[PDB]
Each structure stands twice: as structure tokens, then as C-alpha cells.
Design a protein around this ligand. Structure first.
Ligand SMILES: NC(=O)c1cccc2c1OCCO2
Length: 119
């Protein structure tokens, strides 16, 4: 029932993601010189460094907010890819499966803690 425990849990999950080779294309904003049409397709860029900095600045109020920004990394990849068989898209699909497997208990525990506080 610790209402604050989600923040260190999210820090530790981001550490795991940064050690995974599949995260390398997504660690920093997409290079607009390498991909000059990116902003013709993608309205809101997102990357894992931006998520970690937002967390460390104290600008997420809940893990739901962090989870929305991480899911935007993956939806951007699915919208920008020219093929379902692209290398970088394949990497995002594996990394999304790993993230969803690990974020499930962080969300559950937070929502349980809030319900206990309200009881
Ligand atoms: N196939 C790709 O080039 C691509 C495919 C999916 C996501 C991307 C991609 O390139 C820029 C970074 O984000």
C-alpha cells in the first residue's frame, strides 16, 4: 500500500530497457537529418531519455502517465515503419512485449495503494 513505490520501480524498469540491445534506436529522439520526412508522419516524437528525464524532474504524477508516453514510442514506430518486416519495427515489437510484461504489476500495486488510501 505504498503510494510512492511506483517511481523507483519505473526507474529500475528503464535501467533494464537501456541495457537491452533492442532499445538502441529509441534511446534518444529520432535523428531528423537521417529521417527528413519523420515529422510529416509523426505528430509527437517520444524517446526513452525524454521519459527518464520527465520522471527524474518530478513531472509524472502516476505510472499511468509514464505508461502513456512509453506506449507513444511504440505507436510512433508502428506508424513510421514502411513494412511490418522492417528491422527497427521488429525491435520495437519485442521491446513492447517486455515492457507490458513488467509494467503490469507496477500499475496494479499503485491502483491498489490508492484504493486503500481512499477506503
Ligand atoms: N524502417 C525504419 O527506418 C523505421 C521503422 C520503425 C521505426 C523507426 C524507423 O526509422 C526511424 C526510427 O523509427
Amino acid at each position: 500500500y505504498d503510494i510512492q513505490a511506483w517511481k523507483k520501480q519505473c526507474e529500475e524498469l528503464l535501467n533494464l530497457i537501456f541495457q537491452c540491445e533492442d532499445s538502441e534506436p529509441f534511446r534518444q529522439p529520432v535523428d531528423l537529418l537521417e529521417y527528413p520526412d519523420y515529422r510529416d508522419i509523426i505528430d509527437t516524437p517520444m524517446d526513452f531519455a525524454t521519459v527518464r528525464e520527465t520522471l527524474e524532474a518530478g513531472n509524472y504524477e502516476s505510472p499511468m502517465e509514464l505508461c502513456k508516453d512509453v506506449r507513444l514510442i511504440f505507436s510512433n514506430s508502428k506508424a513510421y515503419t514502411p513494412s511490418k518486416r522492417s528491422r527497427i519495427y521488429s525491435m520495437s515489437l519485442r521491446l513492447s512485449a517486455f515492457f507490458e510484461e513488467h509494467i503490469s504489476s507496477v500499475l496494479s500495486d499503485y491502483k491498489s495503494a490508492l484504493r486503500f488510501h481512499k477506503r
